[PDB]
Amino acid sequence: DETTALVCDNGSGLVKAGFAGDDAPRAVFPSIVGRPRHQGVMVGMGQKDSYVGDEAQSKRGILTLKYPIEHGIITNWDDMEKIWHHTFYNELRVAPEEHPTLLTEAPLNPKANREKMTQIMFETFNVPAMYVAIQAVLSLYASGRTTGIVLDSGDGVTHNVPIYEGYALPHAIMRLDLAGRDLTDYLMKILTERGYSFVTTAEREIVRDIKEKLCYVALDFENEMATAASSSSLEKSYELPDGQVITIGNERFRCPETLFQPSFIGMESAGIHETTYNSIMKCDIDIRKDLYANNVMSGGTTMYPGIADRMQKEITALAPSTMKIKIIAPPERKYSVWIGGSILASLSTFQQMWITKQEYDEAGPSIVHRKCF
Partner 1 sequence: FEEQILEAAKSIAAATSALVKAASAAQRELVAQGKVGAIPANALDDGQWSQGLISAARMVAAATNNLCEAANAAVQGHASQEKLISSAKQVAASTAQLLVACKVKADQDSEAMKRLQAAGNAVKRASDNLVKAAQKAAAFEDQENETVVVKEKMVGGIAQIIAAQEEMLRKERELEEARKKLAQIRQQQYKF
Ligand X SMILES: Nc1ncnc2c1ncn2[C@@H]1O[C@H](COP(=O)(O)OP(=O)(O)O)[C@@H](O)[C@H]1O
Minimum Å gap between C-beta 216 and ligand X is 8
Minimum Å gap between C-beta 142 and ligand X is 12
229 contact choice in Mg ion, its own copies, partner 1, none (CB below 5 to 8 Å, kind-dependent):
none
How crowded is residue 119: how many other Cβ atoms within 10 Å of its Cβ?
15
Angle between helices 111-123 and 77-85 (to 10 degrees): 40
235 binds partner 1 (CB under 8 A): no
Over the chain, what HEC string results?
A: CCCCCEEEEECCCEEEEEECCCCCCCEEEECCEEEECCCCCCCCCCCCCCEECHHHHHCHHHEEEECCEECCEECCHHHHHHHHHHHHHHHCCCCHHHCCEEEEECCCCCHHHHHHHHHHHHHCCCCCEEEEEEHHHHHHHHCCCCCEEEEEECCCCEEEEEEECCEECHHHCEEECCCHHHHHHHHHHHHHHHCCCCCCHHHHHHHHHHHHHHCCCCCCHHHHHHHHHHCCCCCEEEECCCCCEEEECCHHHHCHHHHCCHHHHCCCCCCHHHHHHHHHHCCCHHHHHHHHCCEEEECHHHCCCCHHHHHHHHHHHHCCCCCCCCEECCCCHHHHHHHHHHHHHCCCHHHHCCEEHHHHHHHCHHHHHHHCC
Choice between 116 and 175, CB closer to partner 1: 116
Total binding residues for Mg ion by CB under 5 A?
Answer: 3
Would strands 101-105 and 6-10 be described as parallel, antiparallel, or unpaired? parallel
154 binds Mg ion (CB under 5 A): yes
14-33 footprint of partner 1 as x/- string (CB under 8 A): -------xxx----------
308 binds ligand X (CB under 6 A): no
Choice between 80 and 339, CB closer to its own copies: 339
239 contact choice in partner 1, ligand X, Mg ion, none (CB below 5 to 8 Å, kind-dependent):
none
Amino acid at 82: K
273 binds its own copies (CB under 8 A): no
208 contact choice in its own copies, ligand X, Mg ion, none (CB below 5 to 8 Å, kind-dependent):
ligand X
Minimum Å gap between C-beta 9 and partner 1 is 14
CA 59, CA 7: separation in Å to the nearest integer? 28
Choice between 299 and 341, CB closer to Mg ion: 299
Choice between 99 and 181, CB closer to partner 1: 99
| C-alpha pair distances (Å), 283 with each of 20, 150, 163, 191, 278 | 33, 14, 9, 40, 9
CA 107, CA 158: separation in Å to the nearest integer? 10
- Which strands, in side-by-side order, build the sheet including 33-36? 51-52, 33-36, 63-66
Minimum Å gap between C-beta 226 and its own copies is 33
Minimum Å gap between C-beta 128 and partner 1 is 4
Question: With CB under 8 A as the contact rule, which of the stretches 59-67, 94-102, 231-239, 279-287 interacts with partner 1?
Answer: 94-102
Residue of 71, 181, 288, 357 interacting with its own copies (CB under 8 A): 288
167 binds its own copies (CB under 8 A): yes
Residue of 321, 331, 362, 370 interacting with its own copies (CB under 8 A): 321
Minimum Å gap between C-beta 261 and its own copies is 26
- Interface positions, 133-172, toward partner 1 (CB under 8 A): 141-144
Residue of 54, 62, 128, 274 interacting with partner 1 (CB under 8 A): 128
Residue of 75, 95, 281, 369 interacting with partner 1 (CB under 8 A): 95
13 binds ligand X (CB under 6 A): yes
Residues forming contacts to its own copies in the complex (CB under 8 A) are 36, 38-46, 59-62, 134, 137, 140-141, 146, 163-170, 200, 202-203, 206, 239-245, 283-289, 292, 319-323, 344, 347, 349-350, 353, 373
Residues forming contacts to partner 1 in the complex (CB under 8 A) are 1-3, 21-23, 43-45, 47-49, 81, 85, 89, 95, 97-100, 123-124, 126, 128-129, 141-144, 328-331, 339, 342-343, 346-349, 351-354, 356-362, 364-365
